[PDB]
Structures are given as C-alpha cells and as structure tokens.
C-alpha cells in the first residue's frame, strides 16, 4: 500500500522531494530498477541519491556494494557539475548560497565518504574523479585516507615547495627523499639543507652523487658570477 500510495504522487504530483522521501521509508525494495528507470528520465540527482543512499544499508555479500558506491560517488559528482554549470549560468545570493550549499554538498560528500569509508575502497574513485578535474575534492579524499604517496607527487608537480617539504618531514620512510632529493635541492637548497639537517635518519652516504651534481651545478652557476657565485656551493659545503 505504501508503494502504491507513492505511485500516485510519482505519477501526478511528482514531488519527489517528499514522495521519494516517503518512498525512502520502505524497508525492503525489489523493483529498484523500475523505480530508477522512471527516476532516470526525471534527471533529479537529489532524488536518485536519496534512494541510493538508503539502499546502501543493504550490505548483502559486499563486492557489488562498490558498484553501487561508484554510482553514488558519480551521482554526487555529476550533481556538482550541474550545480557548477548552473552557478556559472548567471546572466545571485541564493546561487551563492547554493554554491555554499555545494560546499555543504561537498561537506556532505565528505560526510558521505567519512561514514562508509571502509565500505567503499577501490581507488576507482580517484580515477573517476580525476577525469572531471576538481582537484579540491581529490585533495580532501587524499587527506581522508592517510597514504600521502599520491599527495606528495601531486604537491611536487604543482610546485608547492613549502607544502612538499612539510609533507616529506612527516614521512619517515627516508627512501623517497633519498630517491627524489635532487629536484628539491635544485629548487631551493637553502630550505632543503635545513630540512635535511632537522629530519635526521638520513645517511650521508646517500645523495653523495646528488651532492656532487649539486656542486657541479653550483660551479656552473659560479662560472659567470663574482660576489655570490658560490652561494649554492656555500650552502652545500655548510650542509
């Protein structure tokens, strides 16, 4: 009867903000595809997400939950682009509030990710979100899961030297530094020397070839300078 009662609202009233919310109170659902097919033509992201979010409680035998989760992540991401396009379609304050609501939706997306983080974890969300740009959401997701492996590479590629140094300071592997310290030293030897000195747990045997390369580069720079010609060389020697 509850399903039949919501059918009349869906067919005529079409107020899915309340009808589907009332339809969301259903315990067990069987015609999910039939309901989704009608809702698909409506193209209402919020209504589709409301039914999908409740359906996520049906744990079943895992596995397929990721497939449902992938659509859930895409639906919110697709809604953000539609909202962003609508926000960019200006030709006001409520839209700015909607943009704030989009940030709240982004906060809701973070809240949705935080709640079921262990449920949905396949690294496919990173690939899914990469194609649509929006690096802020990717950075938030990377902050959510403590890996920092891709975060360090993203920071290095972007060029945030201070942020990259701060991230590397926390990392105690000492192997990534021993691998990629050359570029960091070339970019800013002054800060890199202090970071290496304070970091500790870094054998002087490592980066010996890197030290020689830095000395050669400093000499090449000094080939056409007089006063501060050996300044990078002075920093390397001091280190």
């Amino acid at each position: 009867v509850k399903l039949s009662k919501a059918m009349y609202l869906f067919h005529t009233a079409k107020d899915f903000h309340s009808a589907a919310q009332t339809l969301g109170s259903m315990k067990d659902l069987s015609h999910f595809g039939e309901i989704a097919l009608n809702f698909l033509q409506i193209k209402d992201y919020n209504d589709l997400n409301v039914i999908l979010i409740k359906q996520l409680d049906n744990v079943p035998w895992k596995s397929t939950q990721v497939v449902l989760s992938s659509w859930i992540i895409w639906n919110f991401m697709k809604q953000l682009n539609d909202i962003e396009l609508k926000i960019n379609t200006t030709k006001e304050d409520n839209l700015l509030n909607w943009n704030l609501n989009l940030k709240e939706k982004s906060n809701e997306l973070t809240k949705f990710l935080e709640s079921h983080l262990e449920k949905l974890d396949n690294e496919t969300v990173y690939q899914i979100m990469s194609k649509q740009n929006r690096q802020n959401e990717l950075l938030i997701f990377a902050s959510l899961i403590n890996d920092m492996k891709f975060l360090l590479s993203f920071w290095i590629d972007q060029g945030n030297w201070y942020e990259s140094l701060k991230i590397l300071l926390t990392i105690n592997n000492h192997d990534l530094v021993y691998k990629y310290s050359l570029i960091l030293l070339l970019n800013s030897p002054e800060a890199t020397v202090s970071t290496w000195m304070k970091i500790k747990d870094l054998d002087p045997n490592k980066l010996i070839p890197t030290i020689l390369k830095f000395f050669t580069n400093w000499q090449n720079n000094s080939k056409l300078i007089t006063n501060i010609s050996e300044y990078p060389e002075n920093y390397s020697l001091t280190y």
């Binding site: 097919l37 698909l40 682009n81 960019n88 030709k91 649509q132």
Partner: protein, 216 residues
C-alpha cells in the same frame, strides 16, 4: 489635448560623434547602450522631451496616444537614433530589428537580450573585426562565457569552433575547450548509463519471460 502634444512633438549632428566615441571603447562589460545614451544626455534638447515625457507619464493608459507618439517619432526620426530617447524601454510601441542600431557599434547587454539559437556565428564574426591584439580575444572569450548555454547543437558547436582565431594563445581558450570536452564526455557517459539501464531492464524482462516459461 493631444494637439499640444502634437505641437510638442513637432517642436542629428552630435549624435554621430557620440556614437563614434562610444564605439571607440571596446570593453566587454562597459556601460549599456541605454546607459551610454543616458550618460551622453546627462553630459548634454531632452527638456522638451521631458515636457513630452511629463505628458507621456500622464499617458500611461493612452494606447492610441502612445501609438500616435510612436508614429510621430518615426516621422521625426534623427539618424534613426533619437527614437531611443523617446522609447528607452518601448521597443514594441512601433526585436528582430534593434541589432541594426543596438548591435551596430557595441552593445553587450543588447546582444544578450537579442541572442538566440540562430544568428550567433554572424555576431561572433562581426565582433571579431575589432582587430585588437588581445582585447578582441578577451571580448570574444567573455561573450562565449556569458551565454555558454546558448550553444547546444553539434553542428553549431562545430561551426563556432571552426571560426576560432588562429593567432591567439591557447591559455585564453583553454577553459572553454576544457568545458566543452567535459560536457561532451558527461553527455556520452549519461547516454552510456541510460543504455546500460535499458539493457538491464530488458534483461529483467527476459528473466521474467524465462520464469513464465518455467511456470508451465
């Protein structure tokens, strides 16, 4: 009654200079054509029009008098410009027509007001005659971004992309190209998802038919 208004109506040299001065500026979001006309009038005549405007204000319901005044203004036209003073917002008193004057020199607001699915590539080609080193490119980008939802046809999109400038930095059009590519990818993904959902529904129907076959 209306005889005095006819006498008032009975009672175009610097207009060309003002139009040229306005056309000299090439700002994407400068003052509107009506705004520019009002600014020029303030710098400047309109007192007699204001006296007529006082009668016009009292003629908020005199439709016949409004039509007569519009006809008189048409017969008393000055460079086909001064009528805008008499009809600041009365273009329908006497749309496919303002572009002759509104879009003549420059009017971004009028361009958006009279924009449409068709007659879009011609407007871009006409605006491309600015011949500025980078101001023309900036104006074109602003015009494209302002009404980016207007272009929704594949043929129209291809035609618009074909006539892009060939001496412009890729950075200026990078945002537009990325947005177009993202929109196309999203449309393709939505079509694929709809096709997959239809296939799933067809599979469900086939399963129901197979169950019915099993049912006797």
């Amino acid at each position: 009654s209306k005889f005095l208004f006819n006498y008032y109506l009975a009672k175009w040299s610097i207009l060309g200079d003002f139009i040229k001065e306005y056309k000299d500026d090439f700002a994407y979001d400068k003052t509107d054509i009506t705004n520019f006309i009002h600014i020029k009038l303030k710098h400047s005549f309109s007192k007699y029009y204001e006296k007529c405007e006082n009668l016009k204000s009292e003629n908020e319901k005199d439709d016949e008098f409004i039509n007569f005044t519009f006809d008189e203004i048409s017969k008393i036209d000055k460079e086909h410009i001064l009528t805008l003073l008499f009809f600041p917002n009365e273009l329908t008193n006497w749309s496919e027509e303002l572009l002759k004057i509104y879009l003549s020199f420059n009017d971004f607001r009028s361009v958006e007001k009279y924009i449409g699915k068709q007659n879009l590539v011609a407007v871009m080609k006409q605006y491309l005659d600015i011949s500025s080193l980078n101001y023309s490119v900036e104006l074109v980008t602003n015009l494209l971004q302002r009404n980016f939802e207007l272009l929704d046809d594949t043929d129209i999109q291809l035609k618009i992309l074909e006539t892009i400038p060939s001496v412009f930095p890729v950075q200026t059009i990078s945002e537009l190209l990325l947005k177009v590519l993202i929109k196309y990818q999203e449309k393709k993904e939505e079509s694929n998802l709809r096709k997959c959902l239809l296939k799933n529904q067809i599979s469900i129907s086939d399963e129901l038919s197979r169950n019915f076959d099993s049912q006797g």
